[PDB]
């Protein structure tokens, strides 16, 4: 129905993309100071809009919570450790006879979830527990 287009890297050299569809809204102060600072776009010859800017990430960095508040190598370092974490890799692990398999006893879905997690089935096949963490100094271990 002509509502969505496929763009490669070459054709995207001749287009202008928005971000939020609120950038297409006409606007002519009172703001949350704790909210981050987005510039007004000041450009309006738009041809396309991003579906969601969070879709620039892969399947591993989509697991990361709040990666916009993180120094970016830490997101890289984490994205290679999520492939080391232990959980339920498949619901039929008891039937399959793989060379190695590690399954968590009581997996827990995370308390902080990406909205891209639902398409990644993380809340259905998690790989960590919500441990009660204290950041503390205590005997020095």
């Amino acid at each position: 129905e002509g509502l969505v287009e496929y763009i490669d890297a070459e054709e995207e050299e001749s287009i202008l993309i928005a971000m939020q569809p609120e950038d297409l809204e006409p606007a002519e102060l009172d703001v949350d100071p704790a909210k981050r600072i987005r510039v007004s776009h000041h450009a309006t010859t738009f041809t396309h809009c991003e579906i969601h800017p969070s879709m620039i990430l892969g399947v591993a960095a989509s697991i990361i919570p709040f990666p916009d508040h993180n120094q970016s190598p830490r997101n890289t370092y984490q994205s290679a450790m999520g492939k080391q974490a232990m959980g339920v890799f498949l619901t039929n692990y008891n039937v399959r006879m793989d060379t190695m398999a590690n399954i968590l006893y009581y997996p827990q879905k995370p308390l902080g979830t990406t909205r891209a997690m639902e398409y990644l089935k993380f809340r259905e096949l998690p790989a960590g527990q919500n441990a009660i963490v204290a950041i503390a100094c205590y005997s020095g271990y």
Binding site: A9, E50, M55, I56, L57, G58, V59, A60, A61, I64, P67, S72, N75, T76, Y77, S79, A80, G82, K83, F89, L120
Partner: protein, 43 residues
Amino acid sequence: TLSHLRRTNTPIAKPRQLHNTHWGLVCPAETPEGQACGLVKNL
């Protein structure tokens, strides 16, 4: 397992750097480190 199925190899002027064209086509963060960092990219 999902990450292993969408992974590219780049066998070999600045190939490792996150280029501007990679926006929305390649994960900026997820890539191996050290030996062949940046050549291996995830979609």
